[model samples]
Target: FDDVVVSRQEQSYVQRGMVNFLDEEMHKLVKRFRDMRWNLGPGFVFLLKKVNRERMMRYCMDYARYSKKILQLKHLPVNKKTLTKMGRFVGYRNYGVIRELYADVFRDVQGFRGPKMTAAMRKYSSKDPGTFPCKNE
Candidate 1:
């Protein structure tokens, strides 16, 4: 039973309207889970049954908080190359989540300056080709 454990600050944020508690996608996921018990066979029924509404809501809240943190950062270096490296460094199999998070964060920034992707940086994109790229392309 992996329940979502939200902190007091997170709870307060939700209560204070700092983060949206009624995200449409999250609501749809909750509704889908509720309906899953009816459609799933006995073997998989337990899966949906284990997902309590509170846990689902908390999960959404965590995502919102993470997104907000990324968005609120004033000097965070966000770019495809940087985010891709971050995903790998953090042991993420799929970097899409990192990309999406950065995109959402950058959307709120007035003049975000992402990293440049020159020919030099391109080599580092793949599996360890050689030493890190220099400042100049």
Candidate 2:
């Protein structure tokens, strides 16, 4: 196999690693949240803020795929069971936290308001956590 070259940018590499780390962390988070059937907690919000925004968006899209799957079969006889089973993917679908964080980072780095970036937060902030059972009822 040809040797693969890797460039080092500590901050970006660590941030990218954080996204990968959060991938597993989010799995556990969603499972716990589903088992508990609770709303997003502050701790989760905290984690959300600390990660890279672009990676978070990609992850959110990953989540949306599962969310759509859950929504499609929501009327089935075993919907709750299915949701609980698939909750690992469907839960934490919202990327508002990521978007808001991006907006903050942009403002801090560029010293200017980024209304368009903040718009991502607006889209999901009001929509409710898609996995929360309360929203469906």
Candidate 3:
């Protein structure tokens, strides 16, 4: 007679590997979103509000893939300075607008309630994390 034992080390490794891979892909998608300015305009807001999260994620991934393919074939270079400015502009706008729209629609879709915005939220509505000065220079 013989006894055998099995360990989940390989399964655990695969799970960890997939998690890391997915996390990397998500980061890439977020970077592509900023690079492609995918969050700009009313259309983006509309899609975010209307589409479910899974569909939205797929849409974003597809768009990113398309944009990357286009850029790759064209051999075009992005201006870092311009891209940086645009990222900041889009980020602020998205924070101020898309977030509000998402919160409103998400609640209705999910049938859940969330806390109302507080005064602190209003005070720092710009979405920029810069420090505030008490007195004007």
Candidate 4:
């Protein structure tokens, strides 16, 4: 039996907070972006950087979810449950050297920025006339 006690509420919290993307999909996304760099050739350095960066940040959550699958993956720099997870993985007996391992790796994210920020930024930046990217702000 696992000695660590994770309350049912906490279990649900992790599940609810978990990212929804599949692991394989994330790997492919990164790998595909890398392939784009190699195939697109050297004359496109600026274009390559912008394209790859935009694509990655656009789907960073999928990357985060993939991280969770790998670590078994928090805050402050993360949140409570992620440290609970960290406690199990990177500790001698919990709560000691664990968070040092956890802290540098955790990312505090809340999914894609949208609504007000999206509309305002898009208005200042680019457009497709008015399909829906400006629905909120």
True-vs-predicted CA distance for residue 21, candidate 1, Å: 19
User: What lDDT score is found at residue 22 in candidate 4?
Assistant: 20
Weakest ten-residue segment in model 1 by summed lDDT: 128-137
Highest TM-score, which number?
2
| TM-score versus the correct structure, for each prediction | 0.19, 0.25, 0.24, 0.23
Candidate 1: C-alpha lDDT: 0.32
Overlapping backbone residue pairs in candidate 2 total 0
**Clash pairs for candidate 4:** 74-78, 74-79, 75-78, 75-79
Q: Residue 13 CA error for candidate 4 (Å)?
A: 24
Off by over 4 Å in 3: 1-6, 36-137
Candidate 3 residue lDDT tens string, 1-137: 11312123322222222223333343453455568765333333233423222222333323223333433457654333322333233233234443465555545545322234455544533222212211112
Q: What C-alpha root-mean-square deviation, in Å, does candidate 3 show against the real structure?
A: 18.3
What tens-digit string does per-residue lDDT give for candidate 4 at 1-137?
A: 22234443433233223211221222343365467664322222222222322332343333333324444422133334663343233212222322332232222212211123344453433322111111111
Q: Residue 133 lDDT in model 1?
A: 18
lDDT of 1 by residue, 2-118 (tens): 233434443333322311222223244445546866332222222221122222233434432343345335455544343333323322222234234434434433223334445
Scored against the true structure, residue 11 in model 2 reaches a CA lDDT of 23
**Candidate 2 structure, TM-score to reference:** 0.25
lDDT of 3: 0.33
The digit string of per-residue lDDT tens for model 2 on 45-109 reads 33343443344344443333343344454754323343333443332333345445545554454
Q: Model 2, 125: alpha-carbon shift in Å?
A: 12
Sort all candidates by TM-score, best to worst.
2, 3, 4, 1
Q: Which pairs, if any, clash in model 3?
A: none
